[PDB]
Amino acid sequence: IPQLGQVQMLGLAAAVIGIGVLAAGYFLSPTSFFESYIYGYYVAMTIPLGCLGFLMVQHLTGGAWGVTVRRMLEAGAATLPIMGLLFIPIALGYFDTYKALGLEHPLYEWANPEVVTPGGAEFDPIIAHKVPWLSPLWVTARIAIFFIIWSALALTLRAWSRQQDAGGDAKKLATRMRRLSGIGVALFVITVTFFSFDVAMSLDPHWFSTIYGAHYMANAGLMTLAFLALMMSRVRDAALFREYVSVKPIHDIGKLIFAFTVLWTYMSYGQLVIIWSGDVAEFTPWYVHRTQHGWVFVALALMLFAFALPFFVLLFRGTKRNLNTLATIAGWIVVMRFVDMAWIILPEFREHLWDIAITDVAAPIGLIGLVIALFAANVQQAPLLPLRDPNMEQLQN
Amino acid sequence: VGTKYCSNNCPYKVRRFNFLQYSDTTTETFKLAFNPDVTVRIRGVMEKCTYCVQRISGARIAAKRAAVQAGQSSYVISDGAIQTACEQACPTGAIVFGDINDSNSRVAKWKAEGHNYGLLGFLNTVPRTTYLARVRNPSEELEK
Amino acid sequence: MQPEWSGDPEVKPVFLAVTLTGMVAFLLMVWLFAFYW
Amino acid sequence: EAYLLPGETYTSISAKIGDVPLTPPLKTPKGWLAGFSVAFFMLMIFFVSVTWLFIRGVGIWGINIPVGWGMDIINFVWWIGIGHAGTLISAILLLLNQGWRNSINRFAEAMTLFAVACAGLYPILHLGRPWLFYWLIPYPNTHGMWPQFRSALAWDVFAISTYATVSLVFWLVGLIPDFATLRDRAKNIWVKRLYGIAALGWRGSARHWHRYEMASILLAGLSTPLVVSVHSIISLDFAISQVPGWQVTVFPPYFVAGAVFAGFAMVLLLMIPVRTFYGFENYITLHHLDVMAKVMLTTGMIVVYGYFMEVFASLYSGNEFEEYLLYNRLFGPSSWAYWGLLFCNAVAIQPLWFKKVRQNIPALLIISLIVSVGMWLERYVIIVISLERDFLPSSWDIYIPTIWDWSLYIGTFGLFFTLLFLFIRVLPMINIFEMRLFLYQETEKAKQR
Numbered sequence A: 001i002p003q004l005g006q007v008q009m010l011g012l013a014a015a016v017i018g019i020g021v022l023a024a025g026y027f028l029s030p031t032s033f034f035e036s037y038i039y040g041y042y043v044a045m046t047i048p049l050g051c052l053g054f055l056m057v058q059h060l061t062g063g064a065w066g067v068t069v070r071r072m073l074e075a076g077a078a079t080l081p082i083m084g085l086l087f088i089p090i091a092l093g094y095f096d097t098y099k100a101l102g103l104e105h106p107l108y109e110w111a112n113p114e115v116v117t118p119g120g121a122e123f124d125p126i127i128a129h130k131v132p133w134l135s136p137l138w139v140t141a142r143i144a145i146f147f148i149i150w151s152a153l154a155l156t157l158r159a160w161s162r163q164q165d166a167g168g169d170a171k172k173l174a175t176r177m178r179r180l181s182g183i184g185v186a187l188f189v190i191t192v193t194f195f196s197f198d199v200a201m202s203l204d205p206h207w208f209s210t211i212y213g214a215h216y217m218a219n220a221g222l223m224t225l226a227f228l229a230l231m232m233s234r235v236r237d238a239a240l241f242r243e244y245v246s247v248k249p250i251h252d253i254g255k256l257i258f259a260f261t262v263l264w265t266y267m268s269y270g271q272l273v274i275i276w277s278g279d280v281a282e283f284t285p286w287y288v289h290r291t292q293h294g295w296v297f298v299a300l301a302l303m304l305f306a307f308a309l310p311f312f313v314l315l316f317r318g319t320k321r322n323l324n325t326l327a328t329i330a331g332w333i334v335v336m337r338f339v340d341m342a343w344i345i346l347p348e349f350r351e352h353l354w355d356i357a358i359t360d361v362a363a364p365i366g367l368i369g370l371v372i373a374l375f376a377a378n379v380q381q382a383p384l385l386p387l388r389d390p391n392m393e394q395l396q397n
Numbered sequence B: 001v002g003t004k005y006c007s008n009n010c011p012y013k014v015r016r017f018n019f020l021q022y023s024d025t026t027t028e029t030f031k032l033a034f035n036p037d038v039t040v041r042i043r044g045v046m047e048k049c050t051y052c053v054q055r056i057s058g059a060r061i062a063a064k065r066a067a068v069q070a071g072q073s074s075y076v077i078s079d080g081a082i083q084t085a086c087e088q089a090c091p092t093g094a095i096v097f098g099d100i101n102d103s104n105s106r107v108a109k110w111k112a113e114g115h116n117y118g119l120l121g122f123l124n125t126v127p128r129t130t131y132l133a134r135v136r137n138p139s140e141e142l143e144k
Numbered sequence C: 001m002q003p004e005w006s007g008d009p010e011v012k013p014v015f016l017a018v019t020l021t022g023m024v025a026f027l028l029m030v031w032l033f034a035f036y037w
Numbered sequence D: 001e002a003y004l005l006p007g008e009t010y011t012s013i014s015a016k017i018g019d020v021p022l023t024p025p026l027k028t029p030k031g032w033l034a035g036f037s038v039a040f041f042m043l044m045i046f047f048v049s050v051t052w053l054f055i056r057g058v059g060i061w062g063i064n065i066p067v068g069w070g071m072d073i074i075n076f077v078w079w080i081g082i083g084h085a086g087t088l089i090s091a092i093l094l095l096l097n098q099g100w101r102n103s104i105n106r107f108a109e110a111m112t113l114f115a116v117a118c119a120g121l122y123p124i125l126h127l128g129r130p131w132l133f134y135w136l137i138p139y140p141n142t143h144g145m146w147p148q149f150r151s152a153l154a155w156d157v158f159a160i161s162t163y164a165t166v167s168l169v170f171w172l173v174g175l176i177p178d179f180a181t182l183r184d185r186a187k188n189i190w191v192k193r194l195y196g197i198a199a200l201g202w203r204g205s206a207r208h209w210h211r212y213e214m215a216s217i218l219l220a221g222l223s224t225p226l227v228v229s230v231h232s233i234i235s236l237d238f239a240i241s242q243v244p245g246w247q248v249t250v251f252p253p254y255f256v257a258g259a260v261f262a263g264f265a266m267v268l269l270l271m272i273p274v275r276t277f278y279g280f281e282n283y284i285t286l287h288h289l290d291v292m293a294k295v296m297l298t299t300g301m302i303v304v305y306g307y308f309m310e311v312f313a314s315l316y317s318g319n320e321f322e323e324y325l326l327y328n329r330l331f332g333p334s335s336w337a338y339w340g341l342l343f344c345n346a347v348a349i350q351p352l353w354f355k356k357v358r359q360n361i362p363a364l365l366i367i368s369l370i371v372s373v374g375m376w377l378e379r380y381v382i383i384v385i386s387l388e389r390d391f392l393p394s395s396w397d398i399y400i401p402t403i404w405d406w407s408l409y410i411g412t413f414g415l416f417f418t419l420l421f422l423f424i425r426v427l428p429m430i431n432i433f434e435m436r437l438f439l440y441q442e443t444e445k446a447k448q449r
């Protein structure tokens, strides 16, 4: 409870710093504000969507780790309609609100008139081919639909586990949450793969990847697991984590952090070795733009500090059974996921490592601060760690 | 060893596999017709045209022998030194072969033309066999 | 935990024999496969 | 429900599981005799097909010059992919602390090894100079040459060899204490030495069990990323290639999911008879088959998602070649396999969402059989159809298999079923230990509530 208020205050201060420097970035050049907001919303959306999906994975796979962080996963899932309200500046960014707000071109090349209109000045046929799928009405309808399913999934699971505190729970209400999470896991996988497509992979419409989204799956899950381990360390003295939680779920969550780190580097290496070995010139410009002009050193620092050190440090028992050093690892993971999503998103509009403005730090820290503040408000409104539950006995082993 | 992966990945499908024993192993008259500067292939190995490399290797050895006989230590090979067989026998002269780094050669002057193009440029193969696009001369009465 | 052969007198010359096996057999493959042609 | 039925003691576990091996060989059941006779007949079909493959060459298969990888590579990917779910029960469920692996992991490891022996012949067999298979292995020669090591078949050789050796190692350490029980009950004097050196005199003990759980958990931790990578590399022998249907970035997780999907189908098809005919209903409950259908349903959704990713790659791209891929899969000459793929691996998997469909044994068996057949069809659609129509339309040709492709396929079924029948004869098919430990854990949960 009180450390939760401390981390909520820290997130609110981070959000205030972010909104101040983001408004300054609008004051200097609003296109830089909008592209930095694209990056900040993507790396802010790594938290609640992974929170939602991991809540549904643990409802499908009932574990002691899942009961340990069910309420924090439900708070992170509860922030989704506020993520819709934070999305809609982007929706203003690529719509007819262009030619206002100082934008020179719209935020996406399909939102551009000339690059998709027939008989226009540009008529780039790769982007003009996908004009039913990538048009402002279609993309806003798709993203709002995905928002509807995610908010329905998250709020229904949260309300059912809020009903779980009374009764009808040892066989009822958990079979209901099991069925809802079972259908929704497939729904969440396809909708957040398509969301990762429309938000990130459509920024350069010349390129595609079918492992994108699954790459975003692993990124969201590993950011989420490190976030969960980070604030699990803060609420150690909540008296109910001390009553029912031991270091065995801590070991389980550190184990899952290790597994998602290796799963993510497996996904990134899979995409890299597929595009690199089969040197076909529609897949290759993504990695040409990502090892040029200084981005190569970010790629090597990503390989050395977000895989090799996080893998090699997390082979051991202490740094998994112990919780403090697991929290330090998780903080390093969260920072390295920020750096990775910088490498994923910022080459599409920055073109240099030295072109990275202060807004590309303002928007991730600010929007993560908004995420953390709404999250820690959502943990406090309910009792954490659902005490009355048919999967309770795995905490007692 | 015959993996035939090399077939599946070459985007022009020009490689050929000895699936069975295709080479005439028995008939002595057919054994007399084989040119002994090229290997006669056994069952289970790949096949594709080597830029007719028996002629390239022979002209290379000839250039190096004549260079060391003079003592120049240079090894300069003539433009007309290598004529591949499917170049030497084309009656229209469409196939042109030679060195491309040397700008004086016929093939490098042909590849400097604007209608020179490589087949399937989007796969970053950078072909050495390139094509000149068929430039037609139709009349004003049947097309215009 | 320690192994059950940790306090045995055989643990010195057997584990010396594994390396004397290694430097005989591996060096024999080195002699045959690199220096024998 | 419960993963283990009550009324069971450690004497009852050792009696029921241990006495299916160490039966007198002349007292062996006649259903086993009939199945092994059928497997022996199909293994002779294997030997005839391999003989005519070696003598005449690989041209007895229906491969031509566009399709260099016909039905041989399809059966290779199918047979290697069957091993993923067996290793999943072997290692991944050991890592995730899953209580349903305790009766399956012996059968799962065994069919992983036998599917590996069936798969691993195909890289040798598809060469056409198969006696030079060791050239893909880095070995000291007088030539001084090396394997290329950037080819994906060069990764395949290391991958299948390491996977075969690790799955054999996991089988042997998983088998050492059951060897210790079977040595202790054999009642024939010479068979006690045979299971004795197999057990190495295991001497079931603390300071030996500590290293047992420790090495088994840790080897599960080694084999868990390993089978994912080995089936990623089986994907990568298409995924690094420049063919339009093969260069797909989703291929390593999608082939991993297809492998777990087809392997769970095979574990279904080969453990419903092991549950029914051999009286192991208490050890393999109905909740076992429920949770296994659930995991197959998970991997089937990820595979259907992979098909959607292929459809999205072909529609979203402005390239002509991906679009003609989708057309020739949908309306081409070999489009029958793609329609049977969306009937098999997509329509028939949506029954498994409902519990009564999962608990119904004949429905579960037949739906698993459609999973295996449509999984094979997925490998056909990935490999053969993309090799049929390529960049140059002059290099377009149909692929028709001969009788020898089907002969080799049926013969590899014979090798699989023969090795499975010797396994279920001489060795036990359920882990005797780790079921006694599962009995202990179940009664301890019944103690602490």
Ligand SMILES: CCCCCCCCCCCCCCC(=O)OC[C@H](COP(=O)(O)OCCN)OC(=O)CCCCCCCCCCCCCC
Binding pocket: A057, A061, A062, A063, A064, A065, A214, A217, A252, A253, A255, A256, A259, A263, A394, D088, D092, D095, D096, D097, D098, D099, D228, D253, D256, D260, D302
């Ligand atoms: C080949 C398939 C893909 C493999 C992916 C890796 C899987 C993760 C490997 C580590 C396993 C889990 C780590 C430890 C853990 O948290 O498990 C604990 C828990 C059960 O243990 P209790 O103490 O609670 O005992 C309860 C029973 N007595 O395990 C679980 O509950 C299962 C967790 C679900 C695993 C989710 C990871 C899968 C990742 C998704 C892969 C799909 C691909 C996405 C496109």
Ligand SMILES: CCCCCCCCCCCCCCCC(=O)OC[C@H](COP(=O)(O)OCCN)OC(=O)CCCCCCCCCCCCC
Binding pocket: A049, A050, A051, A053, A054, A057, A060, A061, A062, A185, A189, A217, A220, A221, A224, A391, D096, D098, D253, D254, D256, D257, D260, D291, D294, D295, D298, D299, D302
């Ligand atoms: C940010 C989120 C991360 C992304 C997640 C997206 C992918 C989703 C996959 C995870 C789902 C895991 C399987 C769920 C289905 C299931 O039924 O498994 C749960 C079962 C049920 O357990 P019981 O005993 O019946 O309930 C106990 C009641 N007290 O048990 C298991 O835990 C088995 C887990 C199997 C894990 C491997 C299969 C999933 C991954 C394979 C596909 C990989 C593709 C690359």
Ligand code: F3S
Binding pocket: B001, B002, B003, B004, B005, B006, B007, B045, B046
């Ligand atoms: S892939 Fe290589 S192994 Fe032979 S068939 Fe081709 S040269």
